[PDB]
Amino acid sequence: GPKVLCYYDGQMSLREGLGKITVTDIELALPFCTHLLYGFAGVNPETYRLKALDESLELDSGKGQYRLATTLKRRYPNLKVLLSVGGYKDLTEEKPFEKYLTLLESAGSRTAFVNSVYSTLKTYDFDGLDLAWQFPQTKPKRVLDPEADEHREEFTALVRDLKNALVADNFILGLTVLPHVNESIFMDVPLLKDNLDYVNLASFDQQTPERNPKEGDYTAPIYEPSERVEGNNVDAEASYWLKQGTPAGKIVIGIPTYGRGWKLVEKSGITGVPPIPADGPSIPGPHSGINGFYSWAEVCAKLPNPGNANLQGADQPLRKIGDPTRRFGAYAFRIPDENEEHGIWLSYEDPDTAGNKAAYVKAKGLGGISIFDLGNDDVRGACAGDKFPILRAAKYRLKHHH
Ligand SMILES: *[C@@H]1O[C@H](CO)[C@@H](O[C@@H]2O[C@H](CO)[C@@H](O)[C@H](O)[C@H]2NC(C)=O)[C@H](O)[C@H]1NC(C)=O
């Protein structure tokens, strides 16, 4: 059956107010998921063993959230609970990818990591590992790894080692290719595929305020928008893996549940059409405090709704631009006023466009979807009354014809 890999970022239980999303809060999502990917573990740069990113939260000596997550497998029949390592959330050094490269460089360091994965899965009763490896990201338009060729071969060996250590206990091992990770530099697909239960293509964040502060564009297109960066769309990345010989059933497509916003200025123009000049991220989400980053509930609150129908200023509803091609995605915007104020351009996933991605997976015979992430879906049903609308629309279109 098709996979639905649902990420829960445990950091969200640390948030304040309506930003706090706990394990309990995401339980209503679990009937729609085949796997719960608990995010995120990291790597100790001195021992190369797995580490929790917040020990006080995750470990038995603290709040024990690892075990709260794995207990879910005893209340939701057939649900598999994996631990995801990396995800670009392991951010404790100035170059957060460096330890993900040096780990690969010796049998001793690879073995330390493998042994620490096995011990961690057993200790906390995880069902397997999602390898969301923090390779360096390709630089934004305007050398990535001088030892890329060495590291590519060492990564094949690491994945082989993990598989051989995990197989006796039937632990799941999957690979997640994070945004802007170039597989043709770092990954030997024909020598990886046989050791992986899935390959999850996190084909989103194609444009972001952090990488492209001066230009807004579609964050998660299915196909290539005209004259964009070749490869940076779902169809291109899935086809890359297929053309390397990967079984279609092993390929899973990542779907974001969030939006990213850019501040608009005078040089942005007045049409809202991308790519659009900008000046960094827009205002932080009301419930998270993260600049230019919005959960689906936060995006939907900015779109035309009865509460803000005739509101003005920072509250004036955004203009939605639907995508009739269904190839590129939705965006919404407010042109800056005559004082260059309150301008925002927001590219986001919604239930309809997430459904389009799941329907693409079904039509192409791929293996499933992943959801990045449950807590950025509309957990509480604030947008339209229905909880987990993005997840539910994607799951529905993954299995039901249009
Ligand atoms: C990933 O790396 C490869 C090289 O390993 C890049 O390959 C280039 O692809 C473009 C088309 O997108 C070609 O015009 C170039 O001739 C290719 N060069 C090489 C050396 O192969 C690829 O573009 C990279 N992709 C990203 C997104 O960075």
Numbering used by the authors: 24 to 165, 186 to 445
Task: Give the article text.
Recently, two additional Aedes aegypti proteins, A. aegypti bacteria-responsive 1 (AgBR1) and neutrophil stimulating factor 1 (NeSt1), have been described as inductors of neutrophil recruitment at the bite site, enhancing the dissemination of the virus during the early infection of ZIKV. No structural information exists on AgBR1, but based on its primary amino acid sequence, AgBR1 belongs to the glycoside hydrolase 18 (GH18) family of chitinases. The crystal structure of AgBR1 shows a triose-phosphate isomerase (TIM) barrel with eight α-helices surrounding eight β-strands, a fold conserved across the GH18 family. We propose that in Aedes aegypti, AgBR1 functions as a signaling protein when injected into human skin, based on its described structure and physicochemical properties.
The crystal structure of HCM AgBR1 was determined to 1.2 Å resolution, demonstrating AgBR1 to possess a glycoside hydrolase family 18 (GH18) chitinase fold. The core domain is a classical TIM barrel composed of eight parallel β-barrels (β1-β8) surrounded by eight α-helices (α1-α8) antiparallel to the barrel. The insertion domain formed by an additional α+β-fold between the β7 and α7 (residues Y302-Y391 compared to Imaginal Disc Growth Factor-2, IDGF-2) defines AgBR1 to belong to the subfamily A. The consensus motif of GH18 chitinases active site is DXXDXDXE, located in the β4 strand. The key conserved glutamic acid residue, acting as proton donor during hydrolysis of the glycoside bond, is substituted by Q (E157Q). In AgBR1, the D residue preceding Q157 in the motif, which stabilizes the catalytic amino acid and is part of the substrate-binding cleft, is substituted by A155 (right inset). These mutations lead to the loss of activity that catalyzes the hydrolysis of chitin. Only one region of the AgBR1 molecule in the crystal structure (residues R165-V186), which corresponds to a loop between β4 and α4, displays weak electron density supporting a high degree of flexibility. In fact, the superimposition of AgBR1 with the crystal structure of the CHI3L2-chitooligosaccharide complex indicates that its putative ligand-binding site is smaller and exhibits clashes with the ligand primarily caused by loops 2 and 4.
